[PDB]
Ligand binder design. Structure first.
Ligand SMILES: N=C(N)c1ccc2nc(C(=O)c3nc4ccc(C(=N)N)cc4[nH]3)[nH]c2c1
Ligand SMILES: [Ca+2]
Ligand SMILES: [Co+2]
Length: 223
């Protein structure tokens, strides 16, 4: 997260770290057996780390659970990153509590101007590299689709929104991939792509989860 702040240990209790020997992507717990993350985060050999604050120190609150199955969206295009979303099933249900909690799926999409919280363990430097060990958080608005589509001509689809600051300085980044964008208590976005991190006129693009609630509900019930 470039230009955000330290969240506070387990203040984002639905945030997950996907680990395959190291953190590589974020995710969101949506109930004790299911995590949603991004399809560009697909790997074979995932361990879902819940209750995390510092991903390099065991601190007492974490639950490490292995994925029993991974389902990438049937129409995911890795060249355009349309339908960038994936579902990961835990081998055993998580124990929910204060520090491990799930996040609600939306009943409708959010409007431009809505404030959201984005969070992750991803890069903090826009021109350069510095990876944090504790969770970073950023408050960012959903932006008008016109200003989304001007910044990226012919690349935005209906399944995508921009959230961020056009002046740059503040953005999601690599390592935050698959993580949450929560607006008004619902999961509205998944950290997907952008151009660099926090560049002026280049905001983050996010998977528009409200278009997928039906595919999610239906896939988790028959799996
Ligand atoms: N090797 C992998 N399995 C891997 C996984 C995820 C990646 N994501 C990227 C990656 O390219 C990337 N994820 C981004 C997320 C947000 C922004 C942003 N500026 N809003 C930019 C990003 N660039 N490379 C990746 C590689
Ligand atoms: Ca830890
Ligand atoms: Co990424």
């Amino acid at each position: 997260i470039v230009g955000g702040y330290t969240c506070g240990a387990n203040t984002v209790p639905y945030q997950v770290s996907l680990n395959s020997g190291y953190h590589f992507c974020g995710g969101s717990l949506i109930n004790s057996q299911w995590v949603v993350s991004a399809a560009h985060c697909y790997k074979s050999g995932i361990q879902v780390r819940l209750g995390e604050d510092n991903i390099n120190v065991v601190e007492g609150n974490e639950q490490f659970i292995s994925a029993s199955k991974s389902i990438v969206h049937p129409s995911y295009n890795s060249n355009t990153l349309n339908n960038d979303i994936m579902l990961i099933k835990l081998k055993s249900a998580a124990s929910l509590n204060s520090r491990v909690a799930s996040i609600s799926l939306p009943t409708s999409c959010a409007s431009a101007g809505t404030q959201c919280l984005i969070s992750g363990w991803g890069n903090t430097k826009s021109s350069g590299t510095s990876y944090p060990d504790v969770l970073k958080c950023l408050k960012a608005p959903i932006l008008s689709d016109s200003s989304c589509k001007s910044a990226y001509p012919g690349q935005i689809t209906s399944n995508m929104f921009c959230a961020g600051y056009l002046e740059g300085g503040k953005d999601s980044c690599q390592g935050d991939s698959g993580g949450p964008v929560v607006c008004s208590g619902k999961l509205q976005g998944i950290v997907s792509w952008g151009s660099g991190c926090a560049q002026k006129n280049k905001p983050g693009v996010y998977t528009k989860v409200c278009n997928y609630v039906s595919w999610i509900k239906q896939t988790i019930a028959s799996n």
